[PDB]
């Protein structure tokens, strides 16, 4: 045989750069990212760079050739071109003035379904439950964002619909376990089918967009996750016997009723308790958390209709309110702060009300997720690969903080 040339096998063959992967698939960058987002595709750094780059040196992202060749036969790639076809035909219709073939074309616009993407990306339901936490964080984040030109209104409607159905599921299944608070939001945490699901809920607030996030990327992720949520929730409701999707009443939903619109046609920590929601608290987070543990929940009508209770009904065990003043304070509805509920959630134990009562100092919150010289100088010099640095990195940041916070206890006792 001939003298085999350089870079004809091994790390110079499997590893293929981004630019080559573009011209091999015949795609533009933006479409390539889209099919990389929808599928599971990510760069992989080769062990020997200049070997894998035909002797070059410049920093370049690499992919597996096996990975790229899978994208060659993806059926959805065709639906990208069919939309490139569709766009030109709709531009043609508007150019000539056919305001009707424009309307019919838009009705028959090409579509793609991620059914086979979900199956090929997550085969087993347990695989979905593992890799769904970001999806929960994603969809929940978007339901409180003003609709922009980049993100269509119906996509927001899909977030709100899919967000509430999941909240209904957890309350119905009583699978909620913990609910931590932070300036990020309300770090929720539940478990389903053995696997653990965690996410974060943004504070529903009149936020601003920093005008530097590239919304094009964020749009494809929604077009991915909003496909995932429908089929993940579908199995959960079928497993729980509920008819997916649960029916939604428009008239109730336009009254800020939250979960009340949808009908689902230490789990008992708050079973024998009745709570009322005043008009200054995060009703959206509190409605979900209390009903997850059997708490009978009513709320101020200004927060939305559908309240089973009124203000005057004394059956409420705890009238939650963070307002500094309560003019018409009731009886039998001991008035505490919202931090009491989450503290009870974390510990699974009925906490002490008066310490969390109105005007009382807030207790701190807890995150539920959280010869010698010779023996230390010989291995520093008489060994080769130097994994001795593990102490200098792993132990250092743990020792310093442990020394720091242990001194916090002593210094705080001195303050008292």
């Amino acid at each position: 045989a001939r003298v085999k040339q350089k870079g004809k096998a091994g790390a110079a063959r499997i590893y293929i750069t981004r630019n080559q992967a573009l011209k091999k698939l015949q795609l533009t960058l933006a479409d390539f990212r889209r099919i990389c987002i929808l599928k599971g595709v990510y760069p992989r750094e080769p062990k020997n760079k200049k070997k894998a780059n035909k002797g070059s040196t410049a920093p370049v992202t690499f992919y597996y050739t096996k990975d790229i060749q899978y994208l060659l036969h993806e059926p959805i790639v065709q639906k990208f071109r069919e939309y490139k076809v569709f766009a030109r035909k709709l531009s043609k219709a508007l150019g000539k003035g056919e305001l009707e073939t424009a309307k019919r074309l838009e009705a028959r616009k090409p579509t793609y379904s991620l059914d086979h993407i979900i199956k090929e990306r997550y085969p087993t339901f347990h695989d979905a439950l593992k890799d769904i936490d970001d999806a929960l964080s994603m969809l929940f984040l978007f339901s409180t964002m003003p609709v922009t030109d980049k993100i269509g209104a119906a996509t927001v409607a899909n977030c709100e619909r899919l967000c509430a159905e999941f909240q209904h599921y957890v309350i119905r299944s009583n699978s909620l376990r913990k609910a931590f608070l932070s300036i990020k939001g309300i770090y929720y945490q539940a478990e389903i089918f053995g696997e653990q699901i965690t996410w974060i809920v943004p504070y529903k607030f009149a936020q601003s967009v920093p005008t530097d996030v590239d919304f094009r990327i964020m749009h494809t992720f929604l077009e991915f996750y909003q496909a995932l949520m429908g089929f993940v929730n579908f199995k959960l409701y079928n497993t729980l016997g509920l008819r997916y999707p649960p029916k939604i009443d428009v008239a109730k939903s336009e009254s800020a009723a939250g979960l009340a619109a949808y009908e689902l046609e230490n789990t008992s920590l708050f079973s024998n308790f009745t709570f009322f929601l005043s008009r200054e608290v995060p009703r959206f987070s509190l409605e979900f958390v209390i009903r997850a543990f059997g708490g009978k929940v009513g709320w101020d009508p200004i927060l939305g209709s559908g309240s089973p209770f009124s203000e005057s009904d004394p059956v409420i065990t705890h009238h939650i309110c963070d307002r500094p003043h309560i003019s018409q304070k009731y009886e039998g509805r001991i008035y505490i702060q919202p931090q009491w509920v989450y503290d009870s959630i974390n510990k699974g134990i009925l906490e002490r009300t008066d310490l969390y009562a109105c005007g009382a100092t807030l207790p701190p919150h807890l995150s539920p997720f959280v010869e010698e010289k010779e023996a230390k100088e010989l291995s520093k010099m008489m060994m080769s690969n130097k994994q001795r640095k593990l102490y200098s990195k792993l132990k250092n940041e743990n020792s310093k903080n442990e020394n720091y916070n242990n001194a916090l206890r002593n210094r705080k006792r001195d303050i008292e």
Binding site: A107, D131, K184, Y187, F231, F234, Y244, F369
Partner: protein
């Protein structure tokens, strides 16, 4: 199909939201928990 059936069938189209069940690449290395 006359005018109305094609109209009402057009409404019955454009509707595909979780009708069937699919369930009959390493882990993304989930972010660290709250601190």
């Amino acid at each position: 199909l006359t005018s109305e059936q094609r109209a009402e069938r057009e409404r019955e189209s454009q509707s595909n939201y979780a009708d069937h069940d699919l369930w009959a690449a390493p882990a993304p290395k989930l972010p660290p928990p709250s601190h």
